[PDB]
Subunit: 227 residues, 2 copies
């Protein structure tokens, strides 16, 4: 991905968030220059837990088809130390027909929430012992309602609705094509994108960046030179 | 507390949520009749974990001065079983200058989030050995920024901002007078209002006068529906 495309994607996403009356903490708008002037001792949690912006094309080269834009609002340490918080929250922008590829988490339990806009389609499979998709029925809770469904069921979450995905449950999601971008909330146990994502297909969760123009914002995986 | 006032409060809060592009799950709008027709086996989690509406005057007689309106969206079991989820989420309506009294939690750690509207003022004190307010400095993290402040500090959360409150940290909050109602988010570890709230001034309870039919069911009155 080009830095220019990342600037453009983030600019559009901030607008989409504003459109839905979503408000972000001040650090969401810090320029790289502003990050450079911070007291690094006070901001360790941001750097350590990778709070902030995340843009990915999932190791492929068509963001519009396979991609996700996220902001990590809060989090705890993967092991529990030194940040004891057991919970994390993200706010995300899923563009019309944009797909997050099939994956499960080893540890993280997450509630994926349609906070507004279009319709979020979520496809679910149990994992078998080979870590492939199994043919067994899935059992999930959608807003406190427990239900069983066929392997590979595609479930529609309308605005307001949420599904709890336990660890080991394979999920893929997209904004239903033509029904508009979706504002997705995720409230979960601690998030660890370095180690806690198992994609059905082998793929890189972060992208390398073609620095073709100056960065307007800093991504959550690139703080290292600001700490 | 009159059901008519509860009906009204909830009606206004639903509009406020809607004006802030907040969308609630289907069960947020179930009438008592609809609750009566649910498959009780499929909905146990709602009942057991007290998901849904909560309206409180904190056992006092002036909702406008001391009160809160909440909707518990998700939760887990106080003791980790049988609902293993470690996290909870509420969305709340804090009316202009309406106060939530000083309290701490034994167990719950919570991020209090200004999701929109006016400004939220949060007052903070460490709890003493005797569960009184201590004079020690407080150490808090506001959106990943760690800072130390004096006992009893009043901190302003503008829309977008959030503060993490560890267990045992006394807190009280209100919408800054004149800046308007605040939409408050709460993302936390498991919520248990039955056992996990210690108010500085102990709470003393209201019952509901059913002067009109209830439009909605509160999270503390599921008893009849399971
Ligand atoms: O790529 C894995 C990504 O998918 C999510 O779990 C959403 O299901 C994100 O929180 C995570 O960063
Ligand atoms: O009743 C005590 C109330 O105070 C809060 O913790 C807000 O800080 C609510 O989550 C809880 O219901
Ligand atoms: Mn996931
Ligand atoms: Mn509290």
């Amino acid at each position: 991905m080009k830095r220019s495309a990342i600037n453009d994607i983030l600019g559009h996403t901030r607008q989409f968030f504003s459109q839905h009356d979503v408000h972000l903490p001040p650090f969401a708008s810090f320029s790289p220059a502003q990050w450079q002037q911070l007291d690094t001792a006070a901001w360790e949690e941001v750097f350590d837990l990778k709070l902030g912006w995340d843009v990915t094309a999932f190791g492929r080269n068509n963001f519009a088809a396979h991609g996700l834009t996220l902001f990590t609002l809060r989090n705890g340490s993967a092991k529990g130390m030194p940040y004891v918080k057991c919970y994390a929250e993200k706010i995300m922008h899923v563009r019309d027909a944009q797909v997050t590829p099939m994956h499960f988490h080893w540890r993280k339990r997450e509630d994926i929430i349609n906070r507004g806009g279009g319709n979020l389609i979520v496809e679910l499979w149990n994992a078998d012992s080979n870590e492939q998709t199994a043919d067994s029925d899935i059992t999930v809770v959608i807003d406190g309602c427990r239900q069983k469904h066929t392997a590979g069921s595609q479930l529609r979450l309308s605005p307001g609705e949420s599904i709890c995905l336990p660890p080991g449950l394979y999920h893929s999601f997209w904004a239903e094509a033509g029904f508009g971008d979706v504002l997705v909330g995720e409230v979960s146990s601690v998030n660890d994108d370095d180690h806690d994502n198992h994609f059905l297909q082998p793929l890189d969760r972060y992208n390398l960046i073609d620095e073709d123009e100056p960065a307007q914002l800093v991504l959550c995986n690139e703080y290292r030179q600001f700490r």
